[PDB]
Design an enzyme around this catalytic site. Structure first.
Site, PDB file in Angstrom:
ATOM      1  N   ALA A 107       0.826  -1.234  -0.018  1.00 42.88           N
ATOM      2  CA  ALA A 107      -0.022   0.043  -0.203  1.00 42.88           C
ATOM      3  C   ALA A 107       0.835   1.369   0.078  1.00 42.88           C
ATOM      4  O   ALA A 107       0.327   2.433   0.158  1.00 42.88           O
ATOM      5  CB  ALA A 107      -0.988  -0.022   1.232  1.00 42.88           C
ATOM      6  N   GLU A 121     -15.612 -10.642  30.316  1.00 48.44           N
ATOM      7  CA  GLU A 121     -16.247 -10.047  31.752  1.00 48.44           C
ATOM      8  C   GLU A 121     -15.504  -8.836  32.040  1.00 48.44           C
ATOM      9  O   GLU A 121     -16.164  -7.780  32.602  1.00 48.44           O
ATOM     10  CB  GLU A 121     -16.217 -11.045  32.712  1.00 48.44           C
ATOM     11  CG  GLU A 121     -17.040 -10.791  34.302  1.00 48.44           C
ATOM     12  CD  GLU A 121     -17.128 -11.957  35.083  1.00 48.44           C
ATOM     13  OE1 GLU A 121     -17.585 -13.064  34.717  1.00 48.44           O
ATOM     14  OE2 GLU A 121     -16.373 -12.012  36.217  1.00 48.44           O
TER      15      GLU A 121
END
Ligand SMILES: Nc1nc2c(ncn2[C@@H]2O[C@H](COP(=O)(O)OP(=O)(O)OP(=O)(O)O)[C@@H](O)[C@H]2O)c(=O)[nH]1
Ligand SMILES: Nc1nc2c(ncn2[C@@H]2O[C@H](COP(=O)(O)OP(=O)(O)O)[C@@H](O)[C@H]2O)c(=O)[nH]1
Ligand SMILES: Cc1cccc(C(=O)N2CCC(C(N)=O)CC2)c1
Ligand SMILES: Cc1cccc(C(=O)N2CCC(C(N)=O)CC2)c1
Ligand SMILES: [Ca+2]
Ligand SMILES: [Ca+2]
Ligand SMILES: [Ca+2]
Ligand SMILES: [Mg+2]
Ligand SMILES: [Mg+2]
Lengths: 423, 440
Positions: B99, B254
């Site tokens: 890229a 959690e």
């Protein structure tokens, strides 16, 4: 033959429930394999209340184990008495409830609930005459709180004239797994107000303070807390499991003067640290049983008034001395008993004591001081809800803010109802 | 059940992935050929480590991972390296032309030619899961692939897997090891584009890791290898709750409940201890109290910022090794009296604790001492927005002159995408201010 169907849901519900069945199985002389080996006929007189009799003189608890993840029920099945439960009575999913009332009540729980009812119906169909149900669960999580109250609602729809009783563990910031516990507990409390006949309020903060301050445990664990809950559950069900008076409906009729005010504060004595062999006198048992430090709702009884009180004494003791001490506590603190319910303090005696104790006493109070517990929860709920904090966990499951506002008002109404009878 | 699929994007994502999977193999006893003698269930199982490793009938334990890069030279080293037998060839995906440090080429011009194959390979991993929990995506903010292709992939994963959880480990740029002047552009673009698609993102400031290596490990000029070894330890601490079982173990999900109060406020600050050399660790046993206190030393944070100048919305302690609650509670009591940890008024102040008993591990030839116990603190503090502010300021300096912007426009982007992304960042900075103000 007044059968009770026991349900335990979620992590807390199954861990406390497993210990309850370990304690009363010992009291009734039932070994981990379901075989009776006691030495007193009183152990079997009312054994069918909680146990079904299988082939070969085997006794199987009338218990249904429910969870949305497999972990805790795997531990139970491998635990001490894990082999005593009916294999088909394990009903569990794999997704978990993520400490989320909405997942337990509306999405994950909704997918599993029908299979649980199938097992409940199976157990109820083999009862000569079903008394009702008892559920063990926490209110601060997702499965026990959200799916547990979903189960209660569907059981009431199918068994509308049966008694529904719960042992409901209330969350506390001192013994907290997640910050959303007040959300889950507030949502559940409204369900309980509507759909249970009797709820034992067990506050994790009171259990902790007992272990740390009274029992002198430097680092209390959930296991230590559950030891107190096991002993309390055995105490409050003694009058159901042995010859006496009697059944859940009669208890409710004499404990609940107003339908919504059915939340009890339980207590236990003795609570002794390891001076543990000393004999405990009736006065000591009676004084401790009414002491706030022996109570497990974290509410000061001297802040409210007793509508009704039940006290169960276990062991070979002087019933004459029991009455004298009981009548002494009332006639020495009558300012905390409402004067418009005559003779609202009832006493019962059972000859068989709990394992390891010569005698003990269990306390069940319907006190307006329980409003302090609902006030604490309400304040913690509002501190977060004012900022819509953590709500995305619940709206992602399809809930709307309006349902939170309605739960908020419902519990503040409940607090207001207790306050009018306290004056 | 509860499987987790890891996706490593671009050079930084791939090389950090190399370090993480090598460390995982050492923690679990998996050999470079994939065999695990201690695993007695052949070809399957539901053990905790099966969240990250599938199994073949021949006894091979294969990472649930895809490596992707738009040029081949980095992944080629995996294909020929020590753990080449660990991965199936289809798990390592490369193009020919990268890229060029241009978000537009990673998201559009080049990325669009390989995105479909990448998704097909991820689908093959998902099909082998009985209860997929979500994805873990490793990538740099500054590279063209790490920024542009990651955001394209995250958008496509939302479409193909819905709201299935996606967590990031994102490498935040530092000038000491940066390779492109336009890294602030790429960082703002990918942060904007990925924001609504990520449930939780752990930023790793390369300058914080660089300073820790120099300061605590006595490494004069840290390399990517030095940095990635440390990053892997922090990643391992965070995922250990998923890969090991324990009575005191608390699942990462959690902790997540406490860490994310609003969808956009999902960037925890990680702090890890102890980081010490073997020479210093010798005969110096670091206790629970010592490593806990270090968690609140700003010098040990994975992102440079000053939590003393913000407010806490959550504090989590993830211990591993020889640790018991009694020592944790005592350590926390001390800290609660010597450090003023200020929480927002709408949030409980209790610390959330988990303990994994499996002791930490180290890779041979490394810099970290082997220790009996370690801890990673995950906090949600408004102070982490300082990292956004520094990035946004570099963005503003260049964008005001439109410097380098023609490289992005030439690849099809519009100036409106820059201002849209920058406005989202300004709103995010404002969100972090808002949540810290006390309730009326
Ligand atoms: N910690 C760490 N940072 C890295 C590593 N490799 C590259 N970086 C950082 O990542 C940024 C550059 O992005 P890269 O990952 O190299 O680029 P890419 O994703 O391959 O994208 P293109 O090469 O432009 O196609 C710079 O800030 C580097 O400092 C690494 O192995 N470890
Ligand atoms: N007394 C007691 N409380 C528990 C236990 N496990 C969890 N809790 C409490 O229950 C709440 C968490 O709910 P939990 O039962 O774990 O969630 P669930 O599995 O989704 O129903 C928190 O308030 C915990 O403090 C336990 O074993 N004993
Ligand atoms: C999609 C969605 C829904 C609800 C909240 C958010 C969110 O992340 N914030 C940031 C915090 C801000 C605040 N409380 O000041 C409010 C909006 C996003
Ligand atoms: C004080 C006490 C009493 C009984 C049990 C516990 C306990 O095991 N946790 C789990 C961890 C949790 C936390 N804050 O991380 C707090 C409750 C703690
Ligand atoms: Ca489903
Ligand atoms: Ca296996
Ligand atoms: Ca805002
Ligand atoms: Mg739990
Ligand atoms: Mg590259």
């Amino acid at each position: 033959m007044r059968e009770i169907v026991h349900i335990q849901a979620g992590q807390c519900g199954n861990q406390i429930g497993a210990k309850f069945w370990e304690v009363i199985s010992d009291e009734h002389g039932i070994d981990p394999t379901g075989s009776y080996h006691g030495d007193s006929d009183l152990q079997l007189e009312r054994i069918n209340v909680y146990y079904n009799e299988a082939t070969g003189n085997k006794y199987v608890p009338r218990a249904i184990l429910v969870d949305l993840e497999p972990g805790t029920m795997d531990s139970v099945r491998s635990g001490p008495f894990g082999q005593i439960f009916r294999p088909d009575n394990f009903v569990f999913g794999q997704s978990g409830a993520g400490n989320n009332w909405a997942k337990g009540h509306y999405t994950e729980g909704a997918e599993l609930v029908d299979s649980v009812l199938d097992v409940v119906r199976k157990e109820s169909e083999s009862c000569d005459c079903l008394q009702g149900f008892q559920l063990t669960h926490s209110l601060g999580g997702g499965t026990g709180s959200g799916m547990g109250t979903l189960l209660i609602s569907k059981i009431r729809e199918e068994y509308p004239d049966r008694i529904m009783n719960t042992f409901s563990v209330m969350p506390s910031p001192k013994v907290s797994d997640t910050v959303v516990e007040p959300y889950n507990a507030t949502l559940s409390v409204h369900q309980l107000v509507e759909n249970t006949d009797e709820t034992y309020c067990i506050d994790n903060e009171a259990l902790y303070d007992i272990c740390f301050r009274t029992l002198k445990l430097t680092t209390p664990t959930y296991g230590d807390l559950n030891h107190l809950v096991s002993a309390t559950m055995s105490g409050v069900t003694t009058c159901l499991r042995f010859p006496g008076q009697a059944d859940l409906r009669k208890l409710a009729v004499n404990m609940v003067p107003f339908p919504r005010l059915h939340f009890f504060m339980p207590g236990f004595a003795p609570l002794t640290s390891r001076q543990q062999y000393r004999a405990l006198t009736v006065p000591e048992l009676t004084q401790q049983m009414f002491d706030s430090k022996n109570m497990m709702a974290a509410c000061d009884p001297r802040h409210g008034r007793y509508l009704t009180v039940a006290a169960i004494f276990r062991g070979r003791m002087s019933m004459k001395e029991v009455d004298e001490q009981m009548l002494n506590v009332q006639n020495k603190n009558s300012s905390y008993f409402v004067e418009w319910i005559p003779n609202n303090v009832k006493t019962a005696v059972c000859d068989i004591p709990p394992r390891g104790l010569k005698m003990s006493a269990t306390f069940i109070g319907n006190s307006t001081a329980i409003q302090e517990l609902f006030k604490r929860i309400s304040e913690q709920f509002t501190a977060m809800f004012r900022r819509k904090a953590f709500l995305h966990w619940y709206t992602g499951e399809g809930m709307d803010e309006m349902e939170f506002t309605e739960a908020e008002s419902n519990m503040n109404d409940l607090v207001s109802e207790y306050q009018q009878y306290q004056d | 059940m509860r499987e987790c699929i890891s996706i490593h994007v671009g050079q930084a994502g791939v090389q950090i992935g190399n370090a993480c999977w090598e460390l995982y193999c050492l923690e679990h006893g998996i050999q470079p050929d994939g065999q695990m003698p201690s695993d007695k269930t052949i070809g399957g199982g539901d053990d905790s480590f099966n969240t990250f490793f599938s199994e073949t009938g021949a006894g091979k334990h294969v990472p649930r991972a895809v490596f992707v890069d738009l040029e081949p030279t980095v992944i080629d080293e995996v294909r020929t390296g020590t753990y080449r037998q660990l991965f199936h060839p289809e798990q390592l995906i490369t193009g020919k032309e990268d890229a060029a440090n241009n978000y537009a080429r990673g998201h559009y011009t080049i990325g669009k030619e390989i995105i479909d194959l990448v998704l097909d390979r991820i689908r093959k991993l998902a099909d082998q899961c009985t209860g997929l929990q979500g994805f873990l995506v490793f990538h740099s903010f500054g590279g063209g692939t790490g920024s542009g292709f990651t955001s394209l992939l995250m958008e496509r994963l939302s479409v193909d897997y819905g709201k299935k959880s996606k967590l990031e480990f994102s490498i935040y740029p530092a000038p000491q090891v940066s390779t492109a002047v336009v890294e602030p552009y790429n960082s703002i673009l990918t942060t904007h584009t990925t924001l609504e698609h990520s449930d939780c993102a752990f930023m790793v400031d390369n300058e914080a890791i660089y300073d820790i290596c120099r300061r605590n490990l006595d490494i004069e000029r840290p390399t990517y290898t030095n940095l990635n070894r440390l990053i892997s330890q922090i990643v391992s601490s965070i995922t250990a709750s998923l890969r090991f079982d324990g009575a005191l173990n608390v699942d990462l999900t959690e902790f997540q409940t406490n860490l994310v109060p609003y969808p956009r406020i999902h960037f925890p600050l990680a702090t890890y201890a102890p980081v010490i050399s073997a020479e210093k660790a010798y005969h110096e046993q670091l206790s629970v109290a010592e490593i806990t206190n270090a968690c609140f030393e700003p010098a040990n944070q994975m992102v440079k910022c000053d939590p003393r100048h913000g407010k806490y919305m959550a504090c989590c302690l993830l211990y591993r090794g020889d640790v018991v609650p009694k020592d944790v509670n005592a350590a926390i009591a001390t800290i609660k009296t010597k450090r003023s940890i200020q929480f927002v008024d709408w949030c409980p102040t209790g610390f959330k604790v988990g303990i994994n008993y499996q002791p930490p591990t180290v890779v041979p030839g490394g810099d970290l001492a082997k220790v009996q116990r370690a801890v990673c603190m995950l906090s949600n503090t408004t102070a982490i927005a300082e990292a956004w502010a520094r990035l946004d300021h570099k963005f503003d300096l260049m964008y005001a002159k439109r410097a380098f912007v023609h490289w992005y426009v030439g690849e099809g982007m519009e100036e409106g995408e820059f201002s849209e992304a920058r406005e989202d960042m300004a709103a995010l900075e404002k969100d972090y201010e808002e949540v810290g103000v006390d309730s009326v």
